[PDB]
Amino acid sequence: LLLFAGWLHLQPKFSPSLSWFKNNESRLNHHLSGLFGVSSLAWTGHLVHVAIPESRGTHIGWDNFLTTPPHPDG
Amino acid sequence: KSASIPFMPKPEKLDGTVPGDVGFDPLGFSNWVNLDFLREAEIKHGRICMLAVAGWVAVDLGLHLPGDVHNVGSLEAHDTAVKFGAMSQILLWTSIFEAISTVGVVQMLNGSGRQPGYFGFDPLNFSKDAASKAKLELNEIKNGRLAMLAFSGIVTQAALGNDFP
Amino acid sequence: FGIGHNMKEILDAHRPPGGRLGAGHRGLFDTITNSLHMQLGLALASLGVITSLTAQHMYAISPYAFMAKDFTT
Amino acid sequence: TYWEGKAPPSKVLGPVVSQIPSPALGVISLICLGVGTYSVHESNIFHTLTADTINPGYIIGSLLTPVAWGTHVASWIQKQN
Amino acid sequence: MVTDTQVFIALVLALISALLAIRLGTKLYV
Amino acid sequence: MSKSIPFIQRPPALTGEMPGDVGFDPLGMSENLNLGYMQAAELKHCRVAMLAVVGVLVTQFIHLPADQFSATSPLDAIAKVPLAGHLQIFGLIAGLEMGSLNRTYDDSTDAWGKLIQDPSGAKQFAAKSAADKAKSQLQEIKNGRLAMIAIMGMLIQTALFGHPL
Ligand code: CLA
Numbered sequence: 001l002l003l004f005a006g007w008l009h010l011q012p013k014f015s016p017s018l019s020w021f022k023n024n025e026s027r028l029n030h031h032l033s034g035l036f037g038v039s040s041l042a043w044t045g046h047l048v049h050v051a052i053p054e055s056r057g058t059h060i061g062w063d064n065f066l067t068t069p070p071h072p073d074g
Numbered sequence: 075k076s077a078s079i080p081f082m083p084k085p086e087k088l089d090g091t092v093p094g095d096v097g098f099d100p101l102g103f104s105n106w107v108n109l110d111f112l113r114e115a116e117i118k119h120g121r122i123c124m125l126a127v128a129g130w131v132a133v134d135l136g137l138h139l140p141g142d143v144h145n146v147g148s149l150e151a152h153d154t155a156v157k158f159g160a161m162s163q164i165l166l167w168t169s170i171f172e173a174i175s176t177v178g179v180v181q182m183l184n185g186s187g188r189q190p191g192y193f194g195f196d197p198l199n200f201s202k203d204a205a206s207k208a209k210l211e212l213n214e215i216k217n218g219r220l221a222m223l224a225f226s227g228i229v230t231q232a233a234l235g236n237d238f239p
Numbered sequence: 240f241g242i243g244h245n246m247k248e249i250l251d252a253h254r255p256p257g258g259r260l261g262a263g264h265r266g267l268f269d270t271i272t273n274s275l276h277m278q279l280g281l282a283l284a285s286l287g288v289i290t291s292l293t294a295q296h297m298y299a300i301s302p303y304a305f306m307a308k309d310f311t312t
Numbered sequence: 313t314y315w316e317g318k319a320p321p322s323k324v325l326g327p328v329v330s331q332i333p334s335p336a337l338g339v340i341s342l343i344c345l346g347v348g349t350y351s352v353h354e355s356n357i358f359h360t361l362t363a364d365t366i367n368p369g370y371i372i373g374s375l376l377t378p379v380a381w382g383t384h385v386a387s388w389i390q391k392q393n
Numbered sequence: 394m395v396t397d398t399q400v401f402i403a404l405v406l407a408l409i410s411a412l413l414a415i416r417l418g419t420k421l422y423v
Numbered sequence: 424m425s426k427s428i429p430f431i432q433r434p435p436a437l438t439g440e441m442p443g444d445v446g447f448d449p450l451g452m453s454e455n456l457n458l459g460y461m462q463a464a465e466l467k468h469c470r471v472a473m474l475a476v477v478g479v480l481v482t483q484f485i486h487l488p489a490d491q492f493s494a495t496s497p498l499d500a501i502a503k504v505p506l507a508g509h510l511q512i513f514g515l516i517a518g519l520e521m522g523s524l525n526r527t528y529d530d531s532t533d534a535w536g537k538l539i540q541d542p543s544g545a546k547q548f549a550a551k552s553a554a555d556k557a558k559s560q561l562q563e564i565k566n567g568r569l570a571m572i573a574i575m576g577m578l579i580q581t582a583l584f585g586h587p588l
C-alpha cells in the first residue's frame with residue numbers, strides 16, 4: 001500500500017503543491033495529536049484488549065475480541 | 075448613560091442596535107471578546123435553557139413511555155437515561171450539530187457576516203414572512219434569559235428537596 | 240479554524256528587552272521552513288538523543304518479560 | 313510581532329487578552345495563583361494522594377498555576393501601557 | 394507450523410509488493 | 424450560502440458541474456483532494472453499496488436451493504459460504520478492477536467515464552439528452568448516497584443486535 005501511495009503521489013493530479021509541504025501548523029497538529037497521540041491511544045487499547053489478557057492466560061484474538069470486554073465492568 | 079445602570083458610562087461596543095440592549099456591561103465583558111461570539115453564546119444558552127425548563131416541567135408532570143415512566147422526577151433522569159442509552163444518542167446528535175456549528179462560527183468572526191444565532195431553521199417562516207423580525211428576535215432573547223434564570227433556579231431548588239411547585 | 244497559535248508570531252515575539260539576545264528569534268521561522276537541512280539536523284539530533292535514551296532506559300528499566308536474563312540480547 | 317523597547321505590543325497577548333485592562337488581569341492572576349497553590353497543597357502536600365483521592369477540581373486548580381503566570385505577565389504588559 | 398499454502402500466499406503478496414516497488418522506482422524517474 | 428448547511432459559506436473549490444453537488448463539504452476537503460478521483464470513488468462506493476443493500480434485502484427472504492446458501496444474516500452468510508465461492512467472486516471483481524485501472528487514473532475523462540461501463544448502459548446514456556443525462560446522474564448519486572448509510576446501518580445492526588432489523 002505504501003509503495004502504491006508513493007507512486008500515486010508522483011502523478012501530476014495528485015502531486016501536493018509546494019504550499020502544502022510548508023503548512024507547518026497543520027503538520028504539527030496532526031503529527032502530534034494524530035501520529036503520536038492517537039497512535040499511543042491505539043497502542044494502549046491493544047495492551048488493554050490483547051496484551052494484558054494474554055498475559056493472564058486468556059486468549060484474545062480477532063475472532064473473539066469484540067465480545068470479551070477487557071474489564072468485567074466494561 | 076446606560077439605561078440599566080446609570081452610574082456606569084454607556085458600555086462600548088453596545089450600540090443599541092442589538093436586540094435586548096439595555097447597556098448592561100458593568101464589568102465590560104463586551105470589550106474583552108468579539109461581540110458576535112458572546113451574542114451566539116447567549117442565544118445558545120437561552121435556547122438550551124428554554125428546552126431544559128420545558129423538559130423539567132413536562133417530566134415532572136408527564137412521562138413518555140415505560141422505562142422512562144419509572145424514573146419520574148427529573149433529578150433521577152440523567153442517571154436512568156444514561157443507563158438505557160438515551161443520553162448517549164442525544165449526546166451524539168448534539169455533538170454532530172455542534173461540530174458543524176464550529177466551522178459555521180469560524181466563518182463568522184472572520185468576515186462571513188452570519189447573524190449571531192442564525193441558521194436556516196424557519197420552516198413556518200414566522201420571521202421570514204414578517205419584515206419586522208425585531209420583535210421576534212427580542213422576544214427570543216428575553217424569554218431565553220428568563221429561561222436561563224428559571225432553569226438555574228429550578229435545578230438548585232429541586233436539588234434541595236422542595237418537592238414540586 | 241480561527242483558534243490556535245501562529246508560530247511565526249511566537250518566534251518574532253521572543254526577544255528579551257534587555258537586548259542580550261540582540262534581535263531575539265526574529266527571522267528563524269523563515270530560515271527553518273525554507274531550509275530542509277536545518278530541520279533535518281534538528282530531527283536527527285532529537286532522534287539521536289532519543290536513541291541514547293532508549294539505550295539507557297531499556298537496560299535499567301526492563302520493559303520486556305524475561306529479558307534481563309538473556310544477557311546477550 | 314517583533315518588538316523592541318521595554319514592553320511588547322498588546323497584540324502579543326492575542327485577540328481576547330489584549331483587550332483586558334491591567335487591573336482585571338492582575339486580580340484574575342492572583343485568584344488563579346491562589347486557587348492553584350491551594351489545590352496543589354491540599355492534595356499531595358497537606359494530604360497524601362491515593363487511588364481514591366483524585367479530585368478533578370484539584371487537578372484543574374493545579375493546571376491553573378501556569379495560567380496564573382501567563383496572566384501576571386499579561387498584566388504587566390498591559391500595565392506598561 | 395506454517396503450511397505450504399501460507400508460505401505460497403506470502404510469496405504471492407511479496408511478488409505483488411515487488412511489482413509495486415518496481416513501478417514506484419520507475420516513477421521516481423531518474 | 425451552501426444549500427445543504429444554511430449557516431456555512433459555500434465551499435470555494437466545488438461548483439455545480441459535478442452531479443449531486445450541493446456545496447456540502449464543511450471541512451473544506453475539496454480544496455486538497457483530487458475532485459475527479461473523489462467523484463469516481465464516491466460513485467464506485469454508491470454502486471457497490473446499492474448492490475449490497477439490494478442483495479442483503481433479497482437474501483433475507485429467499486436463497487438458492489443449496490442448504491449452505493440458506494444463511495439468514497449477512498455475517499453468518501459470509502461465515503458459511505465455502506472459501507472457493509468467495510475466491511471465485513473475488514477473482515471476478517479483481518479482473519474487473521484490473522481492467523478499470525488504466526482508465527481510473529486518467530484526468531481527461533469524467534467520473535462516469537472512469538469506472539467501467541456496461542456497453543448497453545453507456546450507449547443508452549450517450550443517446551440521452553444532456554438535461555436528461557444530468558437528471559439521471561443526480562438520481563444515481565442520491566439513491567446511492569442513501570444506500571451507503573443504509574448498508575452501513577444494516578451491517579452494524581446485524582453485528583450488534585443479531586438480525587439486520
Ligand atoms: C493523523 C494524520 C497524519 C498521520 C497519521 C501522519 C503520519 C505520517 N506522516 Mg503525515 N501529514 C499530515 C497528517 C498525518 N501524517 C498532514 C496534515 C500533513 C500536511 C502538513 C502531513 C504531511 C506530511 C509530509 C510532507 C510527510 C509526512 C510523513 C508522515 C510519516 C512520518 C514517518 C513515519 O513513519 O512516522 C513515524 C511514526 C511514529 C509513530 C514514530 C514516532 C516517533 C517516536 C520518537 C518513536 C517512539 C515510538 C516508541 C516509543 C518506540 C517503541 C516502538 C517499538 C517497540 C517498535 C507518517 C506515516 C512523511 C513521510 O514519510 O511520508 C510518507 C513526510 O514526508 N506527512
Ligand code: CLA
Nearest residue numbers: 006408410411412413414415416417418419420421422423
Ligand atoms: C531506502 C533506500 C533507498 C531509496 C528509497 C532510494 C530512492 C531513490 N534512489 Mg537511491 N540508492 C540507495 C538506496 C535508496 N534509494 C542505495 C543503497 C544506493 C547505492 C549507494 C543508491 C544509489 C542511487 C543512485 C545512483 C540513484 C538512486 C536513485 C534513486 C531514486 C529512484 C530509483 C528507483 O527506484 O528507480 C527504479 C528502480 C527500480 C524499479 C529497481 C527496484 C529494485 C527491485 C525492487 C529489486 C527487486 C529484486 C528482488 C529482490 C529479486 C529477488 C529474486 C529472487 C527470487 C532470486 C529514488 C530517489 C536515482 C535517482 O533518483 O537519483 C536522483 C539514481 O540515479 N539511488
